[PDB]
Design an enzyme around this catalytic site. Sequence first.
Site, PDB file in Angstrom:
ATOM      1  CG  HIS A  80      -1.418   0.569  -4.521  1.00  0.00           C
ATOM      2  ND1 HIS A  80      -2.253  -0.452  -5.366  1.00  0.00           N
ATOM      3  CD2 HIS A  80      -2.486   1.168  -3.925  1.00  0.00           C
ATOM      4  CE1 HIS A  80      -3.412  -0.458  -5.079  1.00  0.00           C
ATOM      5  NE2 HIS A  80      -3.629   0.448  -4.330  1.00  0.00           N
ATOM      6  CG  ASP A 133      -4.885   2.700  -0.947  1.00  0.00           C
ATOM      7  OD1 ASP A 133      -5.823   2.592  -0.186  1.00  0.00           O
ATOM      8  OD2 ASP A 133      -4.544   1.864  -1.871  1.00  0.00           O
ATOM      9  CG  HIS A 148      -2.266  -0.705   0.663  1.00  0.00           C
ATOM     10  ND1 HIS A 148      -2.326  -2.167   1.281  1.00  0.00           N
ATOM     11  CD2 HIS A 148      -3.393  -0.606   0.091  1.00  0.00           C
ATOM     12  CE1 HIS A 148      -3.826  -2.620   0.793  1.00  0.00           C
ATOM     13  NE2 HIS A 148      -4.150  -1.770   0.125  1.00  0.00           N
TER      14      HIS A 148
END
EC number: 3.1.4.17
Length: 316
Positions: free
Chosen positions: A72, A107, A68
């Site tokens: 990503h 994220d 994460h």
Amino acid sequence: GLMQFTLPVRLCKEIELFHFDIGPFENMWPGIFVYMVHRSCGTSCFELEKLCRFIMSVKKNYRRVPYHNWKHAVTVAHCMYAILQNNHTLFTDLERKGLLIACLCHDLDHRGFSNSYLQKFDHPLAALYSTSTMEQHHFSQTVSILQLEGHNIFSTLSSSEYEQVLEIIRKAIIATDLALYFGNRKQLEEMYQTGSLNLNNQSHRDRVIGLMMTACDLCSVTKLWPVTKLTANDIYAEFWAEGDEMKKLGIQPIPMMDRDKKDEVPQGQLGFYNAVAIPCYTTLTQILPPTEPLLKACRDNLSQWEKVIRGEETAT
Ligand SMILES: CCCc1nc(C)c2c(C)nc3ccc(OC)nc3n12
Ligand SMILES: [Mg+2]
Ligand SMILES: [Zn+2]
């Protein structure tokens, strides 16, 4: 104004394909993102100085976790780039601006833990945001960075356009909560099949942008097998750390997160492709036909995991 980003020839060609891998050279990732904004949106969309300062603050606020992470973020933004470029006429100027930024930010400040671990830990974020806990945090961090001095990449928008673009970004980021995906896709399925899907209905566009966000967020399952297989290691490294942290709270984790049960991973991947990935890319292909390569690649990788199980190849 006349300052283009150009990539080397193999990247210039491969970056247009859905299965493109951004590679191991971190220092090229900002450039790859600017390249994508310039071709997807225009060289006028953002003030280069402000965009570069926004990108570098976003990078700074991604953590050093196995999956994460900043890679990503850029990977999920490239999948959105490929969908937008293969569906040129379906999306507004504001949608193209918002969705690449939403993907890069989706994220922000992830710690590698699920919403469920935050609730069981009793993390402050779980008191502040009772549902889609991490996703409300990611949007909160996006707004924060947008309000740093020199960072407002949207300053040239009108008051009402600015509010529209932040609302596109908020819904787009909230949609990356996989708990909301199941219901969102069932409705898109019903609407498509009973012929009631209307892209001029804002509530319908919202649902379709939500499924695109799921599609980009899961796009590791749409890469060539060696990329997909090596990324799965990073994904499970986070799951096993969460499993460790559940055991420390005196809770036996689900097998998916238990590092003593690695043998169950191949069968867990089948479940995931069948229950989540394949349905996601199927409904997406029905609504946006030119995204069919994502479904084909996903099916190719399901077939690769079946081979892992039949012991016809071992993931190391
Ligand atoms: C939050 C991670 C979501 C996610 N993204 C990808 C690409 C995946 C993959 C390949 N496998 C998963 C198996 C279970 C799961 O359970 C949530 N999430 C998975 N996942
Ligand atoms: Mg997320
Ligand atoms: Zn994500």
